[PDB]
Amino acid sequence: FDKIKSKKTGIFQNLINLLKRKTRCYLMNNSDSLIVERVIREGRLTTIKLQINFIITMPGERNCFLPMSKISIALWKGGERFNQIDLDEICYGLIKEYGVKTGLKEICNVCLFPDMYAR
């Protein structure tokens, strides 16, 4: 549990470092989830909002007896939440391809920087 908490904080701090100056970002929920944000220029001051979760669960009930962790993400454009099934599968695939570290940095690249990215 101690080492996994340390790793959790490490992943968050690395993401914060990779995003801090280009997009200010707010760790919240007693260090469990963080928020990032950029203003889309397609529309006049169109905002895009993303927040991520890394929850650690202590054992006791239903497979093993060890502490284990979970990742999930959420996205909004203009306050409008995007359907969570496809977003979760995106999180799943990109994390599996690039791990949590580079995978989540790249999730933020996708979600907070599409306008650059169209081609």
Binding site: I40, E42, I48, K77, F82, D86, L87, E89, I90, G93, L94, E97, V110, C111, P114, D115, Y117, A118
Partner: protein, 53 residues
């Protein structure tokens, strides 16, 4: 009696090969990658309008 044993041995030999496993794993990877590309293109367009779902 010889021929039956020979053909049975060939039948057993075929399905345990490395290539038979590798091709299926590769096909699964292709399917995953194409689905991921579809989803990424769809969502980035949705972020940028001009989406035409």
């Amino acid at each position: 009696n010889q021929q039956i044993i020979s053909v049975r041995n060939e039948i057993q030999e075929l399905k345990a090969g490395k290539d038979w496993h590798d091709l299926q794993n590769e096909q699964a990877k292709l399917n995953d990658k194409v689905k991921l590309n579809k989803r990424l293109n769809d969502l980035t367009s949705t972020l940028l309008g001009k989406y035409e779902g």
